[PDB]
Design a binder for these strands. Sequence first.
RNA 1: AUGGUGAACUAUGCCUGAAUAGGGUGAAGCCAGAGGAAACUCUGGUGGAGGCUCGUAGCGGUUCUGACGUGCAAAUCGAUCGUCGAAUUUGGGUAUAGGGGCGAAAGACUAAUCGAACCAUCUAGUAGCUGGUUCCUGCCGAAGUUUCCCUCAGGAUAGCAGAAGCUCGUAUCAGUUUUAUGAGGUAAAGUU
RNA 2: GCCCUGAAAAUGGAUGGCGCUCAAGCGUGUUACCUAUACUCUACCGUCAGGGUUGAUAUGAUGCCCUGACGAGUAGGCAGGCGUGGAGGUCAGUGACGAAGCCUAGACCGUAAGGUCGGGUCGAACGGCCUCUAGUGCAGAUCUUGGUGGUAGUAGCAAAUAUUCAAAUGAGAACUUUGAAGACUGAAGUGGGGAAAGGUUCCACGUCAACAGCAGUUGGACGUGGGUUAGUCGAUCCUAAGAGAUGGGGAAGCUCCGUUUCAAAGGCCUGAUUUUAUGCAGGCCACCAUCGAAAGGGAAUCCGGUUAAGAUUCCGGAACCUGGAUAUGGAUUCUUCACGGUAACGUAACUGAAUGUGGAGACGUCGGCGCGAGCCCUGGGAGGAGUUAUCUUUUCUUCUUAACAGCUUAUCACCCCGGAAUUGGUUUAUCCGGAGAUGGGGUCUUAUGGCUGGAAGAGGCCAGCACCUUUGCUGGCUCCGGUGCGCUUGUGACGGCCCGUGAAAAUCCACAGGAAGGAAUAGUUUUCAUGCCAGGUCGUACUGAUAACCGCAGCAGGUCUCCAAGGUGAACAGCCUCUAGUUGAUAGAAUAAUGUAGAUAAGGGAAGUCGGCAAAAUAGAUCCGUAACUUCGGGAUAAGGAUUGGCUCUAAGGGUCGGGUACGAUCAACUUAGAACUGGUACGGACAAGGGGAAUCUGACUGUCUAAUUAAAACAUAGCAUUGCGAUGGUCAGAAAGUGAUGUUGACGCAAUGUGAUUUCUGCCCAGUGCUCUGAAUGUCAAAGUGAAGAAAUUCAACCAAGCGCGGGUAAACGGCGGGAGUAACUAUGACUCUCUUAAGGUAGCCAAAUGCCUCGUCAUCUAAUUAGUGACGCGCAUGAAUGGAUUAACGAGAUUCCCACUGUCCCUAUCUACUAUCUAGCGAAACCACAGCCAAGGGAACGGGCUUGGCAGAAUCAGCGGGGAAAGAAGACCCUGUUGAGCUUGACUCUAGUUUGACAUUGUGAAGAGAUCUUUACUUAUUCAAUGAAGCGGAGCUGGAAUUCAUUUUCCACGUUCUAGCAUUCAAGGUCCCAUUCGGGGCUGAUCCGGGUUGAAGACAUUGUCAGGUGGGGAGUUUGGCUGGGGCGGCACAUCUGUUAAACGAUAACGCAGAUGUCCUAAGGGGGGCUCAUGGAGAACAGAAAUCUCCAGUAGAACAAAAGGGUAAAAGCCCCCUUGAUUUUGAUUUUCAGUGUGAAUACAAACCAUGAAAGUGUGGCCUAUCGAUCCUUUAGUCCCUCGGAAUUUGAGGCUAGAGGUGCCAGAAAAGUUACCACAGGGAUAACUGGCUUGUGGCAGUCAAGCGUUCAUAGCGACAUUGCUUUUUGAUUCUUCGAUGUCGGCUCUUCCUAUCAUACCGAAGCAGAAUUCGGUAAGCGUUGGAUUGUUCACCCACUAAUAGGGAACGUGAGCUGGGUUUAGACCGUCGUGAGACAGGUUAGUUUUACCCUACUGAUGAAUGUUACCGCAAUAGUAAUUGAACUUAGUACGAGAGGAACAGUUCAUUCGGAUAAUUGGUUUUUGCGGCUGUCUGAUCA
Length: 246
Amino acid sequence: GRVIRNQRKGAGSIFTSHTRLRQGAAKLRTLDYAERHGYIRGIVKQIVHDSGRGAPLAKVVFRDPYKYRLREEIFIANEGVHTGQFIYAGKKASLNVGNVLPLGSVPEGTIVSNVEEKPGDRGALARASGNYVIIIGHNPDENKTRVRLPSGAKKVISSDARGVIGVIAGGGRVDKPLLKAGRAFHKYRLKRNSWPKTRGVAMNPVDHPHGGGNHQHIGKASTISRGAVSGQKAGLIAARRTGLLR
RNA sequence: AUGGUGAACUAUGCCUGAAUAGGGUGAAGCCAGAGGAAACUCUGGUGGAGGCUCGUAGCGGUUCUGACGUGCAAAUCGAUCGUCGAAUUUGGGUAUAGGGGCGAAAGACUAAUCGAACCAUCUAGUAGCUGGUUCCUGCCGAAGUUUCCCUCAGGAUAGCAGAAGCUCGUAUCAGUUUUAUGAGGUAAAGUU
RNA sequence: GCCCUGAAAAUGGAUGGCGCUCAAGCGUGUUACCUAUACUCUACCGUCAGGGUUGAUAUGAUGCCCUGACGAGUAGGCAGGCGUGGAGGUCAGUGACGAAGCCUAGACCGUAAGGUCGGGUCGAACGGCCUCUAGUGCAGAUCUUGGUGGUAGUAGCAAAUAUUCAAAUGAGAACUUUGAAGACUGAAGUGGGGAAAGGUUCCACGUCAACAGCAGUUGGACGUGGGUUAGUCGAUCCUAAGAGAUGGGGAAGCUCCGUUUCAAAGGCCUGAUUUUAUGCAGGCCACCAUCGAAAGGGAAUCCGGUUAAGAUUCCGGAACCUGGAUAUGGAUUCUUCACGGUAACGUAACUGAAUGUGGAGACGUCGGCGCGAGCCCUGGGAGGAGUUAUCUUUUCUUCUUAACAGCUUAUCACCCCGGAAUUGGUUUAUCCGGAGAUGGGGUCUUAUGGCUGGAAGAGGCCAGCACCUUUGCUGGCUCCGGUGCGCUUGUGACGGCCCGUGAAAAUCCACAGGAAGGAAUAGUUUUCAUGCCAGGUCGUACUGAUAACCGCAGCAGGUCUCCAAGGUGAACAGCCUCUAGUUGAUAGAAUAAUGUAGAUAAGGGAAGUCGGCAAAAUAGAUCCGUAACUUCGGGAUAAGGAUUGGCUCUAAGGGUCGGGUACGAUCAACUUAGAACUGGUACGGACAAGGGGAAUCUGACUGUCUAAUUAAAACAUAGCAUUGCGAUGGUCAGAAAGUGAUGUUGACGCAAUGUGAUUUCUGCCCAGUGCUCUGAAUGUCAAAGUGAAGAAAUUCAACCAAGCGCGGGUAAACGGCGGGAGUAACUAUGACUCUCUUAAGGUAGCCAAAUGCCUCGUCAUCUAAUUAGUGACGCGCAUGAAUGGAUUAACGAGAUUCCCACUGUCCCUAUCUACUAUCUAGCGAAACCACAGCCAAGGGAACGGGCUUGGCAGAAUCAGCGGGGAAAGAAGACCCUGUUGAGCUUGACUCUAGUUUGACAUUGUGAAGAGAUCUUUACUUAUUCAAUGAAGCGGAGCUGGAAUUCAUUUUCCACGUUCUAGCAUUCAAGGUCCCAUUCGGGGCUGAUCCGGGUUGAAGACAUUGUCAGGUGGGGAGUUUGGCUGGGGCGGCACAUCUGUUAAACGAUAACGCAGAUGUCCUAAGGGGGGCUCAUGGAGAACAGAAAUCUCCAGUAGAACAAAAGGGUAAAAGCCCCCUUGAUUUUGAUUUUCAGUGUGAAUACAAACCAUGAAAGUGUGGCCUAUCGAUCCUUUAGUCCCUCGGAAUUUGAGGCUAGAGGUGCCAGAAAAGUUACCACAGGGAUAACUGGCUUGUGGCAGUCAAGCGUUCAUAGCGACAUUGCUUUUUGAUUCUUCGAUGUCGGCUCUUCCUAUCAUACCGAAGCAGAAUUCGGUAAGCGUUGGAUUGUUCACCCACUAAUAGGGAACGUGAGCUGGGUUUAGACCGUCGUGAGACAGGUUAGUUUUACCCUACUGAUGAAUGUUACCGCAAUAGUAAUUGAACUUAGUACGAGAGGAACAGUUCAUUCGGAUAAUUGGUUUUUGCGGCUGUCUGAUCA
């Protein structure tokens, strides 16, 4: 047979990311003395649009502790920040939108975003627009914290893991019908070559497992085992249930 | 099967450039007037939006089932037609290479090659199948049948045939009758 | 007996032909005669057999002779010879006095292959014989290479409008050169330049062999030369998307990863030196190769002139940049590092290191608005040219101003003053103001414009003088203005759009900071001026295409880009012109057919056709007017109507401008509306330029795709929904990896799918298959470990993960949605109860729908007529719900139906225009070809050009033509075979990458808790992950203080920064103390101390390696029987048995017929004994049609395991009694047969046994069937053989005899599929024509049982029998698969008769009229349509009639392409799937004639020359049918009704002409009219 279309994204030739207009990797600040023993203040210089992403970025400019200069970094902008805002970062900072605190330093029921999985990864969870995690509880001994991931999963992380207060800007984005194949063309030119999607039904027995036949139909179950093997996997993969919800 | 060569055509993404008369329709936004309690609705303007529309260059390639069909042309020529501001058109740079690539999907495209490219070797690949097989004359001269075979377009085996002769030569034979003596159960007859 | 009738088939026509009649016919008899390769006799050749002959003194003993007989021959075999290239010998061979070779209707020998000689050409080598050896003999192979024919002086050299006269050159001119004309490209060019590419094509001179598909004096050719000049233009430099070293890391390795990565990765700024230069000095800065753009970024150049060919490069002049050196003037300095203005900021200058920050480089698109530049238009003036018959203050042309430099200028931005309601300012576009608007006054940038310098001395245009030359010289003028919705490009300020916000870097500058360095008897500054020196390397020519590039080429194709004049007009459309450029494409004469491209048609108006295909009609603008429907956006140019030229006028729309603190004037526009007049009613006058409407199927839309047969209803899309995934991850890659894509990512994300906008809904089903599980059990489970037995190998027994097993969920997962029953007031409908299927029974909806076989469904409507269309109906072969179901406005080069308008599609053709064809000069192929080219019939491979019999036939040809040459194109794509393949699918057979588990190793330290090992959990240092220019870890401290003190602190928290877009750097200021004060340096602290674990997470688990189970079409390799009246299904004729087919020994076939076999039996085997069966008759309680008992008769009518046939009576049967011969060793024989195997049997022998008194009998079944190799496993036997250095015990291997199985039965281990297909072949074999048969089909006789008022034959025929038919359907499989082009229609010719009409006849139960049946008869006719691809059919209307057929089911180098029948796509059923179809639907490349004949037309040599007038052999032959008036309301007739011969006037179909008239046509461009444009207008 042939090598199918999803097996063909691994070698990553024309499928790589379209990286040109991107302002940079949006991260939080390296974890250092000043931030874990106290706070350090920047100001947000301009909040700007990043290509390929859905949410704006902010550029806050800190002062390097050990050398005379400025250093400016790329934060995914929480909703409500504004240029000219002081952004405080560190253990002793205060609870306000945009300030990055450790999670142990905030009461339960606090709404933070761009939170870290492990301390010093410079952010992981809830970076898409409109997302947030809630802090639902603490474990002050063998220090952990109980947070609610934007999907609704409940994860338990370290209490030295930082996160920035508030909701990520760009909420409401998918409320608007996209309305034409052109606007979906301008969406994925800045992301990657995924589009448009030929139904595996509509291709030949070589192109796909769903291909062939004098009618268009799958012919065998569209749910595939998690223990399937490379290229067998197309369709709903290792689903526990299927079909419209009620 | 192995080891090599190709994105100058074409496929799709990226980088950086360039290219596109004139018309029709007249969306938000905005201005004056008219009505009325109101929310608002009605008239005249203003503006100039859209994968809107007619149509040139451009890109295509619907119909004639036209011309041509040892052509101008291994895909062209004429009339007609689709679209013509965006999922557009295109130059160069660039990335993806053969059981791979790329595909808005036709098994399409990948240098006139694509249901597995191109080039050399393994390779004088294998063929129970088609075609061919080169001078004379003399003596002899068949077979399409038995048995067995994944045997039925083929082989082994026996038969028919040629050649080499060998021991011998009055002689045992014979696609024949006669006498003698068995077996038969078809034709007629109606058990013989 | 003969003859006739019965007796009819298609090109013309065959006793073989002519022809034959007291035969040349038929039946028979006697004779004569003809002639085969056979017969007889003879000669000769060879073959075979039988014999004769060895004596010197010859030449053969493979020899000579004698005698006889015999002679076909493919595949095949053998014997004997001929020929070729080399080797050994010999002829002391031949030969320049001519070897070899070649040509030779010259000669000789040989049966032949071949040999010998003569003559001619020719020039250096070569033969005969006894032998050796081999790349040794050609007619084919769609054979290889090479050469050449016929075709043929033929096909053609026809797009892009087009040429002509003269002169010059020359040997030669349609083509070269100049002039003169005529045209064209028309500035989106046929111009003026470049990019890629070429490479010298550029230019000059010479030359014309070849090339330029004609010519050539010309050339992009040929020979010889010459030509490309740079500090500024490019490259070079920078980076983009990417490529790629180093360090490291994999890899047997070629090499791979990665690009700042686990790295000790480097050279600077000057202070310290005045032994000398650079030691030592503090500080720094961590970006850490390189490559990557002639279109992006970027230091700087312009004008004029110049060459045969180069120029932003050379010349002359005028500038500028960069790198470097220093000198002069100015400026500054005593207030050491300038002043002014309130401010915006100003200026000739006017210090500045490390370090840091900011700007530039630096960016999308569209829309209008403003301002510029060039172009366009245009008035006054100064010149030159063209027109002037007349008019024209006229028409055309020259009046130009570079880089650079200095000075002034403007939107936007900004400052000051003042402080706004009575809110004002304000843009085309409504934004602005107490966060300070309008107003008054200023700053600023300088794209841009303005004046001055460049710079008039240049350039241009005029005139005037000299003159082989060289040529100059000489004057003049080179000026002042207007306008815009104009066009092109630049720019600025605004606006729109995005789930799209639209590069990087080198490079340069500014600012912050304050390192340092320097005024006073004098010290700086190269960012002010001026001056000085150097500016390298490679590119530079020319085309950029209807001949310089690529397409084999001098190819109508392909190929990125700039500039862009006037008119018409909306216009960069079309048409026409100015500047520049060509005039190249073979030509000349004629005007046949058929063509190709372009026009027109009387009347009708799709009647043509699969179908309105194709053409026509419409068209621009202005005013009037617009429907259903709709998602309210549209539909809409809906549909439809009215005007439009010319001239002369009227009206409305703008500007600049002066008013002491209402009006006047002038300038300049293309816009609209109105009114009179005007004419052959013409006016978007040419050009350019929608046809429209009522519905249906289908996809929402824009968009995309099979380049070169499909543009679609297919793919895509938005929208909808589902699924995995929280990074120690989801999906994927890699051979590996210190490895990679999504990811510069984080659920509003990434990945995997299915549906397809909107509206409206998405029913029931979890049994199957699949996926999943917070679920549970004690089933199965490998490796390791474990326990036992053994001397050990080893055997076994338990235990075990994951996986399956179990149970749960799951349908917008794959998918399914039946059967059997009941039950509502005539029949009947059937809401419901009941239950059988390992699940549920098709819900809403929709339908003969693209899904409905039957089927041309039934009903209505459309139409004169409808297999079409639409509306309804629905037990729907086989509709139906994200397999998505219904409905839908707008859209569509999609499929279909109807209507209006229009038409040559048609009736029904005709005419016309250019280019061909045709003829001529030059040039000049190819396809194809066995040999060829006249027919009829026959036979024959079943359709001959040749053969046999006839007809016939006269040189040589020209243009047409499409009948034939089963014409050419291609070792049939269809079907089938081969032990040939490939693509794809699966639960096929055999494995595999990956993944999920267990064990051992990495792997150390030790605690808890359950189980007779496991679950927790600690340790850190291995191992793993993560971050950072490895900065603030761990421990103790001091200060407060939450704290609340039960002795005193028991303990944790703390411990410099939160109104604000300011600022944070130099060992740190301060504080203190040192050193030898000397300017400054070294300490401590400021800033607590100790350990140098860089900081977090994880941790003996992950990971890693090696084994092990499981999972694994994601992938690989392979297979997917045989015979067969094609193949498939079935069957077993595949191993067997009986009867028959079988024709009296045996043998004998078919998918012939009737059946059977894969078992059954310790007796049904073996021996022995006694007895008699089936059945009938006659008797006996219950007792019956039969129980049981008894006697007779009883040849087998019973039984004998089973199929059938044989066999059997004191038995072979029935019943008893005893027994295991159904045993052991092995050889011979028969049967099927090779006299092999297996199976079954026969007869003995050697033992040992059963039975019987005994003879005897028995080696399974009374007889004919009931069965199996090698290899492997196993058992018995002897207790034998071997384990090979010698022994013992296990183990293993042998010999002999059994079993376990191959049914495809002489014995592989094996699923589909192809409509994407492939190869080698097959007419050994299908579909398709033909051939034969005729079952049928369809047609014609014979007897007449019988219908008909009686009446068998007016008119029939049943029962049946006898025939014919090749337009039925079949059967066979003879020709064709190295191809006979397949349906139907259109077109056109011809033949048959089986007569539909017409002619003439016979008949009736015929009065007439009418009709009917037959007779001769094929002369002549036979139609227009609706529905359908339709043949067929059936309807409508006409007709005298609307008969049946043949000709390769006539006819595709004649058409068409509707149908079947590829590849694309949709549906229904079916299959797990790829895929399949008694199917429906849509889209789909139709090649060649010039050859030979034939046909149709056209010439023609020889008939002594030549002319005119004829004859007529043979051939062809044509007219047709109807109606009206009359006869006549007569005849016949009660009447109703109602004819005919003759005569006459017109008509239908056909045919031949012809053109007076009518019509069509029009290049008479004959005359007139009209448009745009050009010639200056009138005119032409």
